[model samples]
Target chain A: VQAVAVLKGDAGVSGVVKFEQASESEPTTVSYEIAGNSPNAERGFHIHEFGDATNGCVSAGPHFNPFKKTHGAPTDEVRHVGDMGNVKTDENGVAKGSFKDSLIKLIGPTSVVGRSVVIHAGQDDLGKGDTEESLKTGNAGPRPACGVIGLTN
Target chain B: VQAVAVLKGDAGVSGVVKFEQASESEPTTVSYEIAGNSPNAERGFHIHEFGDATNGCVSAGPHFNPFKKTHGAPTDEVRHVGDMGNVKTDENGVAKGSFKDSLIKLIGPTSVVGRSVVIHAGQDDLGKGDTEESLKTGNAGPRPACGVIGLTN
Candidate 1:
């Protein structure tokens, strides 16, 4: 099995998003524990192509879209591998949970390790909204926080 | 105050390097809890300029030296702020400790919250070795593991 960890920023934002996989053929388990978000907020989350944040979170670049597919829901067959959808925060400004992912891998040509994870300021439209912005970024608005995803045991 | 966490690669490397500071005038407190290192080994540690591990830990770029200073010990006034010296592992291959850092910060242009922390496979000479390689990277051999440092509460 393999697991990955993340550390990144934006004031008033911090957390951990762990990636684990049992085998090459098995789905990856993503466990996240985020804090310091807006109460009852729904934030957009995804893996970016680069871990570079030299110029703050904006330097993380675009979402991890090796497939070059349009942005869509995590369940969409045509969505980018980085598209893990949105994570909602509780009243205390915290979000925690786990889910299984198939498109993302830990040991392969499309590994998400050594990359970055971003959390948007608002809800992600999931490509079901307006044109351009919707298909590109789900109109998730500004990025309030982000972190680099690294490998682990 | 500010805090950050780290999670990265290597079959058995995983941990957190938290950074905290009371204010701009206060020094940052680096609290580390690293597990899975080689037992009783001394690992070279530093903050690479970039968090972009696009092609593994090497993509993290060179040791962060915004001041363009030659590599030296963490206590050397002429050293890179990213130079925080080596972390010694215990008999169990774990390294845990905290130190007050005067060079690294949590805010302003030199903020390290959005950067990467790299652990070398061997000891760093702290630029007191032979020649160019020493002054540049402390001749710290290959990087075995690394992770991006992110902001926290």
Candidate 2:
């Protein structure tokens, strides 16, 4: 299965994210092309609970914690299912990259197909801050941009 | 299967569209609650060819004519699969309604999982105009708001 999300913020942020999975047991490949942000910046990236952005990113809700795990780096074993760490923007204000994730699937009840992908205004601390907020949000700041993930051919 | 789309425009446009199908042979129900529109107005609504709204509604492309058919109302047998016709706005500037559509699906190649649902700034002529554009787009004017359709539980 395959999916794509066209991301946009109230500001200048705009881009696209593509997700592909060979099978339910296989990893989902995530490819992103995010633009319009501060130059040479690294910000938090995650899948939120809801795709609703009516109240901006706020209504999009908190991170996807299907397993009831705390916030951590995407590579961390105890991280939230939605945790994907950060995306680094270049001098031209573009964040582009690709990676494969095991937890985020395109099928089953835990699928991210209808959730929101949010980019934060600040870098994720990955729970290293060791505070309450850190364990919950990776100390990720305000959501600057987001979009809903949808299935594709 | 079921899917949901959280729709939004640059202005106040915000709402949700739900899609559900019992099987490949069954009709897909299209339920929408679209707000932030002109009061007492009617405008065109359709499923566009693409979900990429990087350039507002312009990048969404034309109507989803997988069969390469002419633009007509949702009830017309000769209509494009994306030709959903117009949505009437109430005095409160909200367009809320529900209907079942046979052409739009949530599975297989013709599915609209990653397509866009576009609401125009003008009312649709629905091919009665008997013009070239009418035969293609139902003469629906500028796209004010749109969002990508995504799969849900």
Candidate 3:
């Protein structure tokens, strides 16, 4: 499965994020290549709970947390299912990378398909801060880009 | 192919528009069933040229008119490819209908898939008006709702 990213907030960003099924050598992997974002910066990214873009990115609601866990790193067992961490852009405002995660389900009620992907305006602290919002949103700023997860050919 | 309608502009309308390939009995058919619309009213409907909803329905551009013909009824030979005419809602604010159209190609550059479906605020005159806008937009008023057409399973 994959999604074609649609840029929002006049950020001039766009890309495609692909979620591949588990294989013999690795668990489910997410690969992405984005362009035209803030240069030389790390941006917060996650799978939102809803796919409704009728009211822009804000309508996507909070991060996908089917397990009702606290905000944490993707590597943490207690983290939200959508916690994919940050992607670093180069000076030319491009980021391309891939990582493995076992939490993503391609089938069932918790499947990531039909959800929304949101790129934040600022970096996600990964729950390092002691503030209450940190535990809920990882302190990521406003959403700058969004896209709905859909099946790919 | 099918395109799910994502309602916008708070018109409280949504539905699915499916385009089926031509068959021995049917030339080519477009089936649509929309709900949550204005009860006991007639709404102008057509397939727009673009699938983009970034800036809402207006961003989808003009109606799909590959043949460069004037606006007319869906059954007319001299009409735009998108001229599906008007659809009437029952007392329950639901409109469902199917029509045969040889102009709508499913596997060509003029394909209806990957375009858009625009529901107008007023009734389409079906090119019966005396005004210049009548030939252009059929005097259909503001766009109250819109949706992008995508393939279905």
**Against the true structure, whose TM-score is highest?**
2
The sequence of per-residue lDDT tens digits that candidate 1 reaches over residues B1-153 is 554545567567877787778887789988888888889988888988765545568767888888999999998878988997889999999989989888898666676755678888778899899888999999888887777764333
Q: What is the TM-score of chain B alone in each candidate?
A: 0.94, 0.96, 0.89
- Residue-by-residue lDDT tens digits, candidate 1, A1-153: 444444445577877787778777789999888888898988899887765545567867787898799999999988988998999899999999999999988756676655678887788899999689899888887776776665333
State candidate 2's DockQ.
Answer: 0.27
lDDT for position A98 in model 2:
93
User: Which window of 10 residues has the lowest lDDT sum in candidate 2 chain B?
Assistant: B50-59
Span of 10 residues, lowest total lDDT, candidate 1 chain A = A1-10
Listed for each candidate, the true contacts retained, as a fraction, are 0.08, 0.23, 0.02
lDDT of 3 by residue, A48-86 (tens): 876555566776778899899999889888889898888
RMSD of each: 14.0, 4.2, 10.2
Tell how far residue B130 is off in model 3, in angstroms.
0.6
TM-score of 1: 0.55
Q: What is the DockQ of each candidate?
A: 0.07, 0.27, 0.07
For model 3 chain A, give the 10-residue run with minimal summed lDDT.
A1-10
